[PDB]
Design an enzyme around this catalytic site. Structure first.
Site, short mmCIF file in Angstrom:
data_model
loop_
_atom_site.label_atom_id
_atom_site.label_comp_id
_atom_site.label_asym_id
_atom_site.label_seq_id
_atom_site.Cartn_x
_atom_site.Cartn_y
_atom_site.Cartn_z
N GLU A 136 37.73 26.60 41.96
CA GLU A 136 36.54 27.47 42.05
C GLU A 136 35.81 27.70 40.72
OE1 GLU A 136 37.97 31.11 43.91
OE2 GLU A 136 38.70 30.00 45.69
N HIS A 213 37.79 27.60 54.41
CA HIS A 213 37.79 28.99 54.89
C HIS A 213 36.55 29.26 55.74
CE1 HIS A 213 41.39 30.01 52.77
NE2 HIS A 213 40.87 29.74 51.58
N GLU A 242 42.92 24.67 52.56
CA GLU A 242 43.21 26.10 52.85
C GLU A 242 42.68 26.55 54.17
OE1 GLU A 242 42.25 28.66 49.53
OE2 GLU A 242 42.97 27.16 48.07
O1 LIG Z 1 47.59 36.52 49.15
C1 LIG Z 1 46.23 36.24 48.85
C2 LIG Z 1 46.02 34.71 48.89
O2 LIG Z 1 46.00 34.13 50.23
C3 LIG Z 1 44.66 34.48 48.19
O3 LIG Z 1 44.57 32.89 47.90
C4 LIG Z 1 43.29 32.45 47.53
C5 LIG Z 1 42.27 32.63 48.65
O4 LIG Z 1 41.04 32.01 48.21
C6 LIG Z 1 41.23 30.61 47.89
O5 LIG Z 1 39.98 29.95 47.66
C7 LIG Z 1 42.10 30.48 46.66
O6 LIG Z 1 42.11 29.13 46.12
C8 LIG Z 1 43.47 31.02 47.08
O7 LIG Z 1 44.33 31.08 45.96
O8 LIG Z 1 44.54 35.00 46.85
C9 LIG Z 1 44.61 36.42 46.93
C10 LIG Z 1 45.97 36.80 47.44
O9 LIG Z 1 46.05 38.22 47.41
#
Ligand SMILES: O[C@@H]1[C@@H](O)[C@H](O[C@@H]2CO[C@@H](O)[C@H](O)[C@H]2O)OC[C@H]1O
Length: 327
Positions: A136, A213, A242
């Site tokens: 990011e 996402h 993800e």
């Molecule tokens: O537990 C939470 C994680 O699921 C979260 O992980 C991030 C979510 O956004 C993605 O784009 C990132 O790459 C990934 O690390 O991070 C926050 C945490 O509290």
């Protein structure tokens, strides 16, 4: 005959791809640790630690490293014939106090960055097959994101991170990972031109990660397919890193679960059609354990299995697409 349960990872292996998940913090000590671990080993052949390889946990003081939680993630993937997807070496969130709590100058933060990278990458050399080197780096304007890294060091922190990573583990596949760059848009254009210039300089950017996402509105599938083609033509391997498909918590559950299935199926179809796509992961797998409800006000139920580990419609939808592809 042939085997009774036809799992996602069995189907993934016949397609020469990986299908997996992000492992929650301390998954081995959940109240329901047993069940969580069982579903995960049955279904998946790739594991990304959700948070436990992040700067916060792994490097909590300038001169102390803590590999303990991470090693538990790796041991579990190893015992379970999963590969390990490392996450993440450079990012703007989840930074410890000794980084965010002081002013830095360029040379010192470069030295900090190199030490962190070489220490974590060398420690897991050969055991982590895929590194999210930079996560990011690009704003929601398609400008560089104004992180501590960028503000202190300039844009060069990106190429240096990749170059340091490759040094420490030449066999690791190094990727740039981002959200909302699945379609052709301002942000993916910037990431496109960015990786295109780094590779022209010989920076070892092996791949790109699309976080995926998304929500019940889906994607513009034509744009997503054209986006995968242009990135693949840069000579990149592609990772869906993800995935989750968040749905409103209010009103017709069945309608939304039906849209979720259609989306997951359409995303798999497109991904299986492009041979540069090497892994698809979900940011978790059971709705019991998802970051979505806390981050996205009013949404949840974004994963493959419900809160009782029963598969939801999307799970069957993706299995059917996997099976057709082999057929
Ligand atoms: O537990 C939470 C994680 O699921 C979260 O992980 C991030 C979510 O956004 C993605 O784009 C990132 O790459 C990934 O690390 O991070 C926050 C945490 O509290």
């Amino acid at each position: 005959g042939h085997m009774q349960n036809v799992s996602l990872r069995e189907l993934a292996e016949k397609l020469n791809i990986y299908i997996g998940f992000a492992a929650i913090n301390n998954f081995w000590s959940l109240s329901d640790e047993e069940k969580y671990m069982e579903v995960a080993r049955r279904e998946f052949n790739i594991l990304t630690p959700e948070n436990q390889m992040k700067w916060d946990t792994i490097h909590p003081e300038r001169d102390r490293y803590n590999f303990t939680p991470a090693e538990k993630h790796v041991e579990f993937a190893e015992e379970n014939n999963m590969i390990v997807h490392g996450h993440t070496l450079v990012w703007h969130n989840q930074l410890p106090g000794w980084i965010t709590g002081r002013e830095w100058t360029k040379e010192e933060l470069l030295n900090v960055l190199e030490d962190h990278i070489k220490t974590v990458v060398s420690h897991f050399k050969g055991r982590v097959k895929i590194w999210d080197v930079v996560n990011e780096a690009v704003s929601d304007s398609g400008t560089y994101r104004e992180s501590v890294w960028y503000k202190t060091i300039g844009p060069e922190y990106i190429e240096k991170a990749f170059r340091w990573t490759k040094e420490a583990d030449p066999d690791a596949i190094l990727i740039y990972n981002d959200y909302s760059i699945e379609e052709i848009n301002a942000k993916s254009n910037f990431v496109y031109n960015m990786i295109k210039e780094l590779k022209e300089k010989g920076v070892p950017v092996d791949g790109i990660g699309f976080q995926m996402h998304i929500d019940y509105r889906g994607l513009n599938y034509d744009s997503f397919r054209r986006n995968l083609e242009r990135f693949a033509k840069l000579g990149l391997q592609i990772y869906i890193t993800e995935m989750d498909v968040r749905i409103p918590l209010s009103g017709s559950e069945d309608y939304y679960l039906k849209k979720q299935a259609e989306i997951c199926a359409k995303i798999f179809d497109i991904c299986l059609d492009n041979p540069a796509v090497k892994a698809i992961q979900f940011w978790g797998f059971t709705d019991k354990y998802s970051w979505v409800p806390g981050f996205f006000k009013g949404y949840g139920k974004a994963l493959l299995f419900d809160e009782n580990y029963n598969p939801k419609p999307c799970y069957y939808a993706i299995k059917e697409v996997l099976e057709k592809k082999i057929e």
